[PDB]
From a paper:
The colE proteins are nonspecific DNases, which are produced by Escherichia coli to eliminate neighboring bacteria. To avoid autotoxicity, the producing cells co-express Im proteins, which tightly bind and inhibit colE’s activity. In the colE/Im system, comprising four homologous pairs (colEwt2/Imwt2, colEwt7/Imwt7, colEwt8/Imwt8, and colEwt9/Imwt9), each cognate pair forms an ultrahigh affinity complex (KD < 10−13 M), whereas the non-cognate pairs show non-protective affinities (KD > 10−10 M). Our results demonstrate that the design of substantially different backbone conformations, orientations, and sequences at the binding site generates dozens of new interaction pairs from a single starting one.
To verify the atomic accuracy of the design procedure, we determined the structures of two designed pairs by X-ray crystallography: colEdes3/Imdes3 with >3 orders of magnitude pairwise specificity relative to the wild-type colEwt2/Imwt2 and colEdes7/Imdes7 with low Im specificity. In both structures, the conserved hotspot region formed as predicted. For example, colEdes7/Imdes7 exhibited relatively high cognate affinity (51 nM), but Imdes7 bound three non-cognate colE proteins with similar or up to two orders of magnitude higher affinities. In the multispecific colEdes7/Imdes7, however, we noted a conformational change in loop I localized around Ala25, while the rest of the loop was atomically accurate (0.7 Å Cα rmsd on all Im side chains). Nevertheless, this local difference relative to the design conception prevented the formation of a designed hydrogen-bond network. Finally, backbone flexibility may disrupt the formation of the designed polar interactions, as seen in the crystal structure of colEdes7/Imdes7, enabling alternative binding modes and leading to multispecific molecular recognition as for Imdes7. By contrast, multispecific designs, such as Imdes6 and Imdes7, exhibited low Z-scores (1.4 and 1.5, respectively), including, in some cases, alternative backbone conformations of lower energy than the designed conformation. Imdes6, Imdes7, and Imdes8, by contrast, exhibit α1nM values <0.1 and are expected to bind multiple colE proteins at this concentration.
Residue numbers in the entry:
A (entry chain B): 4 to 109, 112 to 130
B (entry chain A): 1 to 88
Write the structure that this text describes.
């Protein structure tokens, strides 16, 4: 399903100054509502394709960009996922990941359902 | 290349060049991940990749700041330091 193409849909959620503090929690972190507006109806070859445009939009949001230090800002500017804190990594999974809160319907592109998580939160892939 | 076995085979200047290569981030993503993995292997610092991506507020977010924290932490924990070069 992550390798299948499709159309971005949904609203996202309002987000403050400690956005990815939620990434390791039960909920994970939501797609910021304003980021959600910029991706709606775009078509994606696979979920890896959505991931790149998402982090690019995050880098262009000053309120989100400043929640990262210099090296992570350079990554998201290039569409790469930021490094997660070392304690929140799992082996070679060093970077924040995009996952789904609830079952995907017949989907993977529903931005009400997409969560940013730490590798550790999503340890059992 | 003369092979590195530990961080003590690096002069501080050589290690700063290595950290600047990482900070420059001109490599492929795969190469960048392998450079950070090697960085952690060499420093043995429990912060791991946090020295690069989640630096503490009380030093410079720069290769020089990273090398300074590694140098001070390793010395205080009775670990081997950098090779002395011809600056000494």
């Amino acid at each position: 399903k992550r390798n299948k193409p499709g159309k971005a849909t949904g609203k996202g959620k309002p987000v403050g100054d400690k956005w990815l503090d939620d990434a390791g929690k039960d909920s994970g972190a939501p797609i910021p509502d304003r980021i959600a507006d910029k991706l709606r109806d775009k078509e994606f070859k696979n979920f890896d394709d959505f991931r790149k445009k998402f982090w690019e939009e995050v880098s262009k949001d000053p309120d989100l960009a400043k929640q990262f230090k210099r090296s992570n800002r350079k990554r998201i500017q290039q569409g790469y996922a930021p490094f997660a804190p070392q304690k929140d990594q799992v082996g070679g999974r060093t970077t924040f990941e995009l996952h789904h809160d609830k079952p995907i319907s017949q989907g993977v592109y529903d931005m009400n359902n997409i969560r940013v998580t730490t590798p550790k939160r999503a340890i059992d892939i | 290349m003369e092979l590195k076995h530990s961080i003590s085979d690096y002069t501080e200047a050589e290690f700063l060049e290595f950290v600047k290569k990482i900070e420059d981030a001109n490599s492929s993503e795969d190469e960048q991940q392998k450079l950070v993995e090697e960085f952690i292997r060499l420093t043995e610092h429990p912060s791991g990749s946090d020295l690069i991506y989640y630096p503490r507020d009380d030093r410079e977010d720069s290769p020089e700041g990273i090398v300074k924290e590694i140098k001070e932490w390793r010395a205080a924990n009775g670990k081997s330091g950098f090779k002395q070069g011809l600056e000494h």
